[model samples]
Target: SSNDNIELVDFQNIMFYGDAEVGDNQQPFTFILDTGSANLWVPSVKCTTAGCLTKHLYDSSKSRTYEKDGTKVEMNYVSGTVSGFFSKDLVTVGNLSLPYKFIEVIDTNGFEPTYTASTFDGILGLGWKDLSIGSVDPIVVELKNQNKIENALFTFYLPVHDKHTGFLTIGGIEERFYEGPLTYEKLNHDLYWQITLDAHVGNIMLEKANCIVDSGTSAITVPTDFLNKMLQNLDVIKVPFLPFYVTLCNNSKLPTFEFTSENGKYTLEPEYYLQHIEDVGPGLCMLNIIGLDFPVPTFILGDPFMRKYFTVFDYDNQSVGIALAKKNL
Candidate 1:
């Protein structure tokens, strides 16, 4: 008696501010939400340099409706640069309750100068494939192609303070979702959800590990000999005290970290990797490590292990389900 109705959206981290025409009148910018790239660009009010006037600048002349098929694109990132020249408008976010999406208008004066300082004025690629928007509508693939949803897939919990109560479900899975028995793995390509790590964190036994479930990566990374064999079996002589860059603070004691799928086995505790350790700067926190290093082979399962598991991305049955999460039953 708990399918939990599922319709929670509370996703705060907004900013959209439009106007950046290409065949008409444009000027004004700001955009965010990049589930690790897909498409929906911005940043070009003729970019007067100096980090493009501190972001938020798109002005095709003031927009009387625009479109400039003069195509010219180049986007590379891992740090800086964002070229542009493909115009077409009618993009707006917030209040209109969602309706008006057709973007990509960059012009950033040939960008790259470490992007000047970047404060956000572009980047809304909620990735899931469509390689830069030729099709895939994102927003969970337009709520699973408008069947309105029974399970196109959606699951995440990400909360541990900052008020805590993370959500983002669109069609189902919630009656506190997660009753165990679901394990999956088979997506060497389709873009993501590539798992394979043969678990064990206490006695340190991880072998062919390769993960990637990135909700736009912001934490979790291991590879220094599997983070020194899971911090030498969590003996902790220090390292553990995040304040927000993401959230973690082990404090030692060790023990819970199993995984093993195919049918059973789950285990994880140490307060779930010290509740998502995140400090990213001074002493550099952000470590929920269980193992990492797939660079070119790729690997991600972000959102701090999908808020402790309950995933399912079927994509019409391409497969990806990992159970055990009805509020951690």
Candidate 2:
């Protein structure tokens, strides 16, 4: 159930670090790593919500490096709204650092309930040219230009249940990381890893199961049918008192989900499966496994699933490659 032949870089903390200042003053922040959307933005220091407590707020007045253009920018998500003027400042991450860039500085904020508990403080966009960050070049592109990387290509391997691990290869795939042929997938203009998924429980197949490999999300979410079918096949029992009518109380060992690539077939362990629930009343709640419904536009393959396989993000050819880690590729 493992793709042991593929090798990919592992990026952890995938969350925003903090804000950067021009000379000494703090400005808005940036995301650590993102691929689903475009643009770099940070929560403003002016925010008063409890969720903003852990975030590093910018103080434009105290910094000698702060500049505010009269341009208003807004980004809306399914969870919240962050809108404000764009500014430029120095940003740094690990050993990689850059300066003078136009990034969104969120001033107005009204977040969906989910945003309050979001793990990331900001967003670092990694989309293609159609969805590139404004004023500054993409982080990977910048790295390549500085000779820090050979190409704009990167790799990822997300580990579920344990700390995620993966890498961002600069130019090409490392032969030492993978063991088999690379299964390539064409990329849309948006630059996301587009793939077709067939979720099955034993021999029973679940229809309309497709997934997009996204680094921005934290976990894997499938359609309801896939969840039900997979769980049914695994012999998971239903918690009568629970709302979702599902539970692993009777199941001990984790189930396995399978994936087929052009090179070969792979299996994913069920430890990555996440249980979703909603409170219906005091001490009463629904217990349901989460997934996308059939015919849904997209299902996200988050880090949990990606970490198990070797993934190559190719910007030059606009394609993604999957293979077995540490094998011949």
Best by TM-score: 2
Candidate 2 lDDT tens digits, 24-115:
43343434455666566766666555656765666656665566764767766544666666776555543345554554455434664545
Model 2 residue 137 lDDT score: 65
Tens-digit lDDT string for candidate 1 (172-255): 556455665677666555655555655666666664455556554544555556556555544344444632222225344455
True-structure lDDT of candidate 1: 0.50
RMSD of each: 16.8, 6.9
> What's each prediction's TM-score?
0.30, 0.68
**TM-score for model 2?**
0.68
